[PDB]
RNA sequence: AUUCUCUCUUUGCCUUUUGGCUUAGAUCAAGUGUAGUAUCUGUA
RNA sequence: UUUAUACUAACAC
């Protein structure tokens, strides 16, 4: 799906941690998985 | 001012990390002196770290070692050391261009055509929408998964 | 342990002139990681 | 809603004594424990040291304070910011004699710490006696530092009188640092002294020590300007005439224009043509038409004269 | 004319970045239900 | 009396 709410936390997440970590971010996104969370980043 | 003494290090490390990953490590304006400091004292590390993945893959080949730790670590250190050099084999294939050379590929293709020609070979079509065998085929696929 | 024998005269050669361009040419940008960024310290994505 | 996901965290986090004589010593004791621990954690780390002393003076003064700076100075001798901090805290309670020893220690212990040297005398002026300042200022000149060591030594001699010592101090500075600016700095003092005879022999002394290779073109005009002060026509001409001969192509043009400036003051427009014609030929001419254009200039200058 | 304080404009200085090192040191969000206690919200 | 959170958890399947 990927709505706005998701992406605007993700952008805040990468600024926080770094693009290297991905499973720290997918915890805070709940329904997203570190493969999608990373994948959807390098696309968009 | 000595506000760099400690500061220089957090590059060094990041440099080292950068190497292991294979990502490049350009850095905005820092002294070309201290760029080298750190390109040099990385290069050292990257020996005594490669060296060892040699020396422990030949205390395992043999038998000596045990406990995952070592057979776990010096499986990592390889997996990097090998990805490093499957990266170069790609980059230095687009830069150095196809190794086949058209004339060679022309022969290989054409000779292949004559073989399929000799057989009276029929090419495999795209699955029909009314195909008796597909249901059978799918189950097999899953059973394998 | 006790305190050392009091120090001696330093007697350096005379301090060389530095200039403001030289002290800027040794400017060291604080490096920032791809991975190890502990604590908080948020950094915008245009500084990466 | 990207920038608002960060700023909303800050505002949310933003919203979220003593009696008796006996009970103060408990409070005062526990702060001593605090400080002593931070020293054990970090042998060196002067922030924790400096602090510790300051804190003791306000409470008590003397031993605890005057030990701790001494104790911390053993860990790093050559930290200037500890040196000073330790000095200031004495004079805030006014014991100068105490400090004047401590000031000497540093001076000796490190001679190329200018910050100590200036600060050594500055205290002296507030303190009083001026004879102390000189003996201090003299033994800084045995290390023979720099102009700004000397000139601060002379501006003691000018603020107060006794202007014969100042002149001899000026002489010493010439011997150690022999360069042109120094020599002309000497003449400054004879200007306020008002001894026109005494000026000339100093200017003469400059020509003795330097020699041909050492003197500037600037030196001779610094001479000339003094002749405009006295308005002597006999000195002026013969200085310029003599001075022009040592510089030629190196520093010519600048000197000629100053010679004419004098002739503007004082039939007698012969050098007006010679200064213009020399400057016309002096104009560089790379090429054929550039040199031929200059040939039209100097030929007209030769024709008229 | 000097010194001190306040206000504005332009410019300088930093603390190492939260101690270091490894196989990114390592793995992946089905828990729910009841009982008791504490806090908060509403009913001249 | 209802709702949420934590503590009870030195619980149970």
- Break chain D into its structural domains and give their ranges: 17-266
CB B17 within 8 A of CB C35: yes
Residue among D259, D266, D204, D202 nearest D232 (CA) = D266
Any idea what DSSP says for residue D111? T
Residues in contact with D155: Cβ distance below 8 Å, sequence separation at least 6, in sequence order: none
Cα D132 to Cα D124: distance, rounded to the nearest angstrom: 7
Contact C44 A21 (CB under 8 A): no
Is the CB of residue C22 less than 8 Å away from at least one CB of chain A?
A: no
The residue written with tokens 């991975």 in the block is C35
CB D177 within 8 A of CB D147: yes
Ordered alpha helix ranges (H), chain B = 9-21, 32-48, 50-55, 68-94, 102-119, 134-144
Ordered alpha helix ranges (H), D194-232 = 196-210, 218-230
List own/partner pairs for B80-89 with CB under 8 A and 24 or more apart: B80/B20, B80/B22, B81/B50, B81/B53, B83/B22, B84/B22, B87/B22
Length of chain C (residues): 48
Cα C48 to Cα B20: distance, rounded to the nearest angstrom: 19
Cα B80 to Cα C20: distance, rounded to the nearest angstrom: 45
Cα A22 to Cα A19: distance, rounded to the nearest angstrom: 7
Residue among B2, B11, B72, B81 nearest B46 (CA) = B81
Residue among D196, D200, D195, D144 nearest D174 (CA) = D144
The gap between D194 CA and E7 C1' (Å) is: 48
Q: Provide the greatest CA pair distance for chain C.
A: 55
Cα D172 to Cα D166: distance, rounded to the nearest angstrom: 10
- The token pair at B141 is 């696929």
C41 beta carbon to strand E: under 7 Å: yes
CB D190 within 8 A of CB D199: yes
Contact D145 C11 (CB under 8 A): no
Supply φ then ψ for residue B56, to 5 degrees. -95, -10
Cα C23 to Cα B3: distance, rounded to the nearest angstrom: 12
Any idea what DSSP says for residue D214? T
The gap between C21 CA and E12 C1' (Å) is: 13
Cα D187 to Cα D226: distance, rounded to the nearest angstrom: 9
Q: How many CB atoms lie within 10 A of CB B87?
A: 11
A32 beta carbon to strand E: under 7 Å: no
Q: Which of B3, B4, B35, B38 to mutate to test the interface with C (most CBs of C within 10 A)?
A: B4
Residues in contact with B16: Cβ distance below 8 Å, sequence separation at least 6, in sequence order: B42, B45, B46
Q: Which of A15, A17, A19 sits opposite C44 (nearest CB)?
A: A15
The residue written with tokens 């600037």 in the block is D218
- Note the strand E nucleotides within 7 A of protein beta carbons: 13-25, 27-29
Burial classification of residue A3, based on how many CB atoms lie within 10 Å of its CB (0-12 exposed, 13-18 middle, 19 or more buried): exposed
Residue among D299, D289, D79, D15 nearest B2 (CA) = D79
Length of chain D (residues): 305
DSSP-derived secondary structure for B44-79: HHHHHTHHHHHHTTTTTSSS---SHHHHHHHHHHHH
């Amino acid at each position: 799906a990927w709505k706005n709410t998701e992406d605007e936390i993700l952008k805040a997440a990468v600024s926080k941690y770094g693009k290297n970590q991905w499973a720290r971010i997918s915890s805070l996104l709940v329904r997203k998985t570190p493969k999608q969370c990373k994948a959807r980043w390098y696309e968009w | 001012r000595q506000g760099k003494s400690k500061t220089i290090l957090q590059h060094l490390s990041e440099a080292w990390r950068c190497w292991k990953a294979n990502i490049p490590w350009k850095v905005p304006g820092l002294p070309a002196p201290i760029e080298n400091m750190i390109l040099r004292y990385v290069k050292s590390k990257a020996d005594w770290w490669t060296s060892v993945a040699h020396f422990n893959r030949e205390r395992i080949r043999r038998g000596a070692t045990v406990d995952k730790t070592v057979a776990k670590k010096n499986l990592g250190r390889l997996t990097r050391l090998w990805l490093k050099a499957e990266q170069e084999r790609q980059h230095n294939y687009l830069k150095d261009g196809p190794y086949v050379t058209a004339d060679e590929a022309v022969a290989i293709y054409t000779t292949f055509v004559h073989w399929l020609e000799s057989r009276r070979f029929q090419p495999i079509p795209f699955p029909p929408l009314s195909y008796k065998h597909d249901t059978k085929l799918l189950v097999l696929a899953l059973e394998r998964l | 342990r006790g305190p050392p024998s009091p120090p001696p005269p330093v007697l350096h050669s005379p301090p060389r002139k530095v200039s403001a361009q030289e002290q800027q040419d040794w400017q060291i940008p604080p490096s920032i990681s791809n991975w190890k960024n502990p604590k908080g310290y948020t950094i915008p994505l245009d500084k990466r | 809603x990207x920038x608002x996901x960060x700023x909303x965290x800050x505002x949310x986090x933003x919203x979220x004594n003593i009696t008796d004589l006996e009970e103060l010593q408990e409070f005062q004791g526990r702060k001593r424990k605090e400080f002593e621990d931070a020293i054990r954690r970090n042998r060196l780390a002067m922030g924790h040291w400096m602090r510790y002393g300051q804190w003791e003076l306000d409470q008590k003064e003397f031993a605890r304070a005057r030990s701790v700076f001494e104790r911390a100075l053993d860990v790093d001798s050559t930290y200037i910011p500890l040196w000073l901090k330790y000095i200031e805290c004495e004079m805030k309670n006014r014991n100068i004699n105490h400090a004047r020893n401590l000031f000497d220690r540093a001076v000796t212990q490190l001679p190329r710490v200018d910050k100590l040297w200036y600060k050594y005398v500055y205290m002296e002026e507030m303190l009083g006696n001026i004879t102390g300042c000189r003996q201090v200022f003299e033994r800084w000149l045995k290390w023979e530092p720099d102009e700004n060591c000397w000139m601060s030594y002379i501006r003691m001699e000018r603020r107060y009188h006794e202007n014969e010592r100042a002149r001899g101090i000026y002489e010493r500075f010439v011997v150690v640092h022999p360069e042109v600016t120094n020599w002309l700095r000497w003449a400054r003092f004879e200007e306020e002294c008002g001894n026109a005879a005494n000026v000339r022999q100093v200017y003469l002394a400059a020509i003795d020590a330097l020699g041909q290779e050492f003197l500037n073109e600037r030196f001779f005009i610094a001479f000339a300007k003094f002749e405009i002060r006295q308005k002597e026509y006999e000195r002026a001409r013969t200085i310029f005439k003599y001075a022009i001969d040592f510089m030629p192509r190196s520093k010519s043009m600048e000197l000629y224009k100053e010679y004419t400036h004098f002739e503007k003051q004082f039939x007698x427009x012969x050098x007006x043509x010679x200064x213009x014609x020399x400057x016309x030929x002096x104009x560089x001419x790379x090429x054929x038409x550039x040199x031929x254009x200059x040939x039209x200039x100097x030929x007209x200058x030769x024709x008229x004269x």
